[PDB]
Nanobody
Framework: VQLVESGGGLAQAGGSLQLSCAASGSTSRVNAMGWYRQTPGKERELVAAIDRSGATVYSESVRGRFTISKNDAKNIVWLQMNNLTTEDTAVYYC???????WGLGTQVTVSSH
């Protein structure tokens, strides 16, 4: 199992960022994939998850603004972070349903106007 996150950046409130998660190696079609995020002092929290059928779940903080999707060809899970708010500033991590190791994640900062 190997998780590789790509993307990130400094965004403005109302802007957009696209993160990707690659699950090379093991059976990348056995369980779900999820995006998590963590802020200083706080606990890591689920953002969104997708299963092999394409079904999705979202945290209420991001429902309607973020979209999770999968490219079964390239074996990539995307987090489409739209309508960004300062609340979205965090390190973002992707994880499969078989738990295990965390990747290094990638950092997102959202600045107010």
């Amino acid at each position: 199992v190997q998780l590789v996150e790509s993307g990130g950046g400094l965004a403005q409130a109302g802007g957009s960022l696209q993160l990707s998660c690659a699950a090379s190696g093991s059976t990348s079609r056995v369980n779900a994939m999820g995006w998590y995020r963590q802020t200083p002092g706080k606990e890591r929290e689920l953002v969104a998850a997708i299963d092999r059928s394409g079904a999705t779940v979202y945290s209420e903080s991001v429902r309607g603004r973020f979209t999770i999707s999968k490219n079964d060809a390239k074996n990539i899970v995307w987090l489409q972070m739209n309508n960004l708010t300062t609340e979205d500033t965090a390190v973002y991590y992707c994880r499969s349903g078989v738990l295990g190791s965390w990747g290094l994640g990638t950092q997102v900062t959202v600045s107010s106007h």
